[PDB]
Design a binder for this molecule. Structure first.
Ligand SMILES: Cc1ccc2[nH]c(C(=O)O)cc2c1
Length: 168
């Protein structure tokens, strides 16, 4: 149904809301939720752990089956697997983990995976355990994504800093 409500429109195609991505998925019933994935689709932490828990581990079981046959993703890459109870599809997208020395330049490749989907519910890529500057990630999102992206930021203080930064 893609019933996004209460978003702030930043650009013609980028929207943001102070919200929990799991509660947004349940409310909105998106066609596609983006996972903040790692290359082995091991969803023990970060947004990936929250999504997986909300699928009662179905996302991890599917991901383990996928990886054993298909091999890992690349940093900046993606795959499309089931959205389970959260969405029709899950676009697993690997942003660079700058806490572990990966190239922040790959955040552009990471966001280019969104352009194959008309509308997405998504987290800010490379935030949290991936260690990237969120203000930078929002800029790369706005510069790179052409399709409609609805970003969910749960931390209110970070949300407020992102909106204040974007309106400068
Ligand atoms: C949760 C869920 C499941 C199946 C779904 N299909 C669609 C669609 O856009 O056709 C959205 C959606 C959301």
């Amino acid at each position: 149904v893609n019933s996004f409500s209460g978003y702030l429109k930043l650009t013609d195609n980028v929207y943001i809301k102070n919200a929990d991505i799991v509660e947004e998925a349940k409310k909105v019933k998106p066609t596609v939720v983006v996972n903040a994935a790692n290359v082995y689709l091991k969803h023990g932490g970060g947004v990936a752990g929250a999504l997986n828990k909300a699928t009662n581990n179905a996302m991890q079981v599917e991901s383990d089956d996928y990886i054993a046959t298909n091999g890992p993703l690349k940093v900046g890459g993606s795959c499309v697997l089931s959205g389970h109870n959260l969405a029709k599809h899950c676009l697993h997208v690997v942003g660079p983990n700058v806490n572990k020395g990966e190239d922040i330049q790959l955040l552009k490749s990471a966001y280019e995976n969104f352009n194959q989907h008309e509308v997405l519910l998504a987290p800010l890529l490379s935030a949290g355990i991936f260690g990237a500057d969120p203000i930078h990630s929002l800029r790369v999102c706005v510069d790179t994504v052409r399709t409609n992206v609805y970003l969910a930021v749960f931390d209110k203080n970070l949300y407020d800093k992102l909106v204040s930064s974007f309106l400068e």
